[PDB]
Assembly symmetry: C3
Homo-oligomer: 417 residues x 3
């Protein structure tokens, strides 16, 4: 019955447990460094992250065309001047760049971007991965692997495997969302899908999935979906999910990850910075969970206004695992409210965060900023049960922290450690 | 003797809040003379449907296997899965520990066998006395359903509740399931016709008036789906327009509408199977505007309805909003709702009800809510103190009494 | 010295925020040379429509009897019902107290007759000087409606506002009520046709151009319902498309859209009878994308629009979002909005406007909002300070000037 005797010691012990727990980051856009140039890293890549492109375009008089015509260094220079020098870098994405520099032993105080660049010029990808995963305390990274991308598909077809720290996830947007165009690529690749949606088309699409499952050994198959997402639906998407994806997933015991609420290309000229958000109906997700009890679903949603009801839906269905605070949700005010709602209604039965890192060094700030918030939530929740006379031990806190940052994910996808 | 600093204010407000007897204006408890339908004890607390939903997120035991377990075994499984194997940090898990502690039991031991021994030595009457004392609740409003055969008999035998328990007439089967319920009405001698004519109208009114007579309810209540609309040419829309509203106005009894529940999305979970959806405000707005002589108590289930519900209260004095219902009854939501409510309505609302299904829940439902409501009050008083206003301890006691008891009785026009 | 802890940052930020002169970019105040339409004094504070809604939730006085009372009588009733019989803890009630205190009056006495004496002794001009000084407001943007006969007079008599007050051309009757308004245009010599054709288009453009010439407005404004959509084959859709946007582009004048107000759900309440609804973002999205040479100022009334409004501002630099309008202008909501906005937009937004209808409200609207905005800034500067950034006091002063004044003038392309 030795246990934690005060809130101040609780806070110390929780913060230490959270900081020390190696993270599984279950959705990123990073790649094993052996995949080469598609692994993005360094300060110029940090600064030209699309979140920062959106932000600089609210201030700068430089036209979008002129921006895209600049070199990466020039874009980074402009972003630095407009968002850090001419106004204080108070936004979450700008703060994050500074957290990264500090983590790396660079000094934000000098504002010396040329000195920062020198740091990265002297390293290999493999070295930077080692440094960054250590600093961010991340043991495992789940990638986003898109067989429709020519520059990724090559490494796979060349027999490359990621190192043991990097795990595959099969990204299926082009197949589910753009089948009218994508069906022709499948044909080019020997999958004899017909004009008509018949048994032959069903079989060849299942074979496409099975071949990539065999190749990648993905931990889940994923898709991003619009605010209008509905299921069942008479559409290529509704048919592919019903006839191909769900049966394959069940057979292979692979979860289906759905990232719902992104409205694509509302400002096309902005590229990756041009996507918007909408509230979705919960009906399709509800139907999927109820009607496919032998399938597992990972869900994150983009609208603030979906988050509470998504937690309630998790209370209804054990084949739903909700994860992370995605994109426009990934800001302190929202991370805090979401994490509290989730813990109040689900206890520790969810995955509080993922980084969605596109640039390697972002693991540093995405985990630092989120861990501090998650630690605050845990401190309050433990203190409340301490107040109720419960005895919490440091071993129990370590166990719960491991569940939230790692074990709940592996347990749900039916694998590792 | 003036209140001169936040620190002094905080102690005065917490004392006033703690000391104020509560009227709990919507519960699923029953006067103890109604028998076994009053649920109580640690096995009942642990097998509350909120905890059933939570344990099914973790356990390998199937739902079928779970329902086949005895109550004690279900309670044991829930204890192991939600308190021993993971820390009991959820609001519903924390609530069980609050009740245990309140009763003088020691959660440090985690000894469910010992806790059970406490309950085995007591009668229902003794436990009600204990619980209402510890929760500082003076008055409990029940949910009395004349369509439940069990509950019906008791009222038909002329059994009256204890004076601490007040009736409220539950109408879901009548309003939401008329096709099916009209056959029972006619078994009971209410000659409702196949068509909605004057005959039907008068006999439904007679059913309402008969039950008002028997129950002396403080309000009539219904829970409603996110799709709720009014006017509507449906059985619900016709009964409300033609029968419920006129009867309610004549007897000056409010109509309680609990809006936002989507029933049985996961049928096998039973009570743990219901979901939530955002509702349109249009139907509520229409009722308030078009029936100014009727009074309406509303609580809604969707987070995304709460702010606009507060605005609608600003518009209509015949609306009384109440409580943080079910999926809203979690600290992060209780806090945001109570602040939005106080900022736009001052003290003209009812901040909380327990919806207790198990007697001992009054202990944590009230404990956990009072701490949050006290903190909101402290901030709001502090803000007017900083503006130069002098608040007296007697004024705090008054406002606290309005929130926890008097606003309800004023609105219903009673006690 | 120089800033190396949260404690020091808090001192510097609070000083910067308190000292920064405010441009209040949307109010319902008027240059004092406009005469009686400039509302001021304690009785006007107390009878603000926010307080009429609140008193009606408590008083037994009927709405008809209320409107039959004199202003002083109305103000007496509201004081008794909202300040004396219950603690004045609501945001709007707290605001009255902050004004009294700011003017050097003592709320501790509750001496309404003494408070009244204060104002009886001053001219409009003196009180404008006092209030703008106390509130640290350098510039006030008015709402000027050429459809209002009284207002139209000062403009037609060539009266110009005092250099501290700026015009904004309010267009609601034209855009929202064209069928009724076309007759008045015709009367004024704007000879619109029955059919929406080139004839009608040119006469509506001429109306706008004439009023732009007369008023020199900083923006043209309209308030819109939750059902607002664009493009739309309606008089509103057509006037915006064919007249308003091209005229705005030619004069480089922004269009301010205040979206989400549902008018007169409770008619008898007058100004206090308006409600809220969530709107589609589709119309605003279309307008921003398809009219890149037009500038748009937007504020929305529903809590549930705020986050997605901030995301839309990330997408479009021709969108400036502003303020926490009306039902949003409460501490709980101001805080969450200001945080969401800063997290996603840095300093590239206008955190607040007063919408003051009564002169003295500038005091509380800015005092209450500045304290919240300062705390949000302290958190955000601290986060980058802890991350190793050197924040200077001059940078703080710059950022604060952008939020409270410069961002507005930069966007509108003026002062
Ligand atoms: Cl973005
Ligand atoms: Cl919503
Ligand atoms: Cl539940
Ligand atoms: Cl109002
Ligand atoms: Mg909040
Ligand atoms: Zn992603
Ligand atoms: Zn209930
Ligand atoms: Zn206004």
């Amino acid at each position: 019955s030795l246990s934690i005797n005060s809130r101040e010691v609780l806070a110390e012990k929780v913060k230490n447990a959270v900081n020390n727990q190696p993270v599984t980051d279950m959705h990123t856009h990073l790649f094993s460094p052996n995949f080469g140039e598609i692994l993005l890293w360094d300060i110029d890549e940090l600064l030209t992250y699309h979140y920062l492109v959106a932000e600089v375009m609210r201030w700068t008089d430089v036209s979008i065309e002129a921006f895209w015509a600049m070199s990466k260094r020039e874009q980074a220079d402009l972003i630095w001047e407009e968002l850090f020098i001419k106004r204080s870098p108070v936004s979450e994405a700008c703060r994050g760049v500074l957290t990264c520099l500090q983590g790396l032993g660079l000094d934000p105080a000098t504002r010396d971007l040329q000195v920062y660049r020198e740091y990265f010029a002297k390293k290999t990808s493999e070295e930077q991965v080692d440094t960054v995963l250590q600093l961010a305390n991340v043991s495992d990274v789940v990638m986003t692997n898109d067989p429709f991308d020519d520059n990724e598909r090559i490494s796979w077809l060349e027999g490359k495997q990621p190192d043991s720290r990097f795990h595959a996830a099969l990204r299926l947007d082009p197949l589910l969302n753009e089948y009218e165009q994508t069906k022709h690529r499948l044909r080019d690749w020997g999958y004899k899908v017909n004009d008509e949606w018949n048994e032959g088309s069903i079989q060849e699409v299942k074979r496409f999935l099975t071949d990539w499952i065999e190749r990648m050994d993905p931990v889940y198959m994923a898709v991003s979906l619009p605010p209008t997402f509905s299921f069942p639906e008479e559409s290529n998407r509704g048919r592919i999910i019903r006839d191909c994806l769900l049966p394959v997933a069940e057979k292979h015991n692979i979860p289906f990850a759905m990232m719902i609420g992104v409205k694509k290309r509302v400002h096309p000229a902005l590229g990756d910075a041009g996507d918007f958000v909408g509230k979705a109906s919960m009906d399709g997700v509800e139907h999927l969970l109820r009607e496919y009890p032998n399938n597992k679903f990972l869900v994150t949603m983009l609208s603030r206004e979906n988050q509470h009801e998504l937690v309630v839906l998790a209370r209804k269905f054990s084949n739903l695992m909700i994860f992370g605070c995605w994109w426009f949700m990934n800001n302190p005010e929202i991370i805090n409210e979401m994490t509290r709602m989730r813990m109040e209604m689900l206890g520790t039965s969810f995955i509080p965060q993922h980084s969605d890192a596109r640039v390697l060094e972002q693991l540093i700030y995405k985990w630092h900023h989120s861990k501090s918030i998650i630690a605050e939530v845990l401190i309050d929740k433990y203190d409340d049960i301490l107040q109720a006379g419960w005895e919490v031990t440091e071993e129990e806190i370590k166990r719960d922290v491991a569940d939230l940052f790692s074990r709940n994910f592996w347990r749900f996808v039916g694998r590792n450690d």
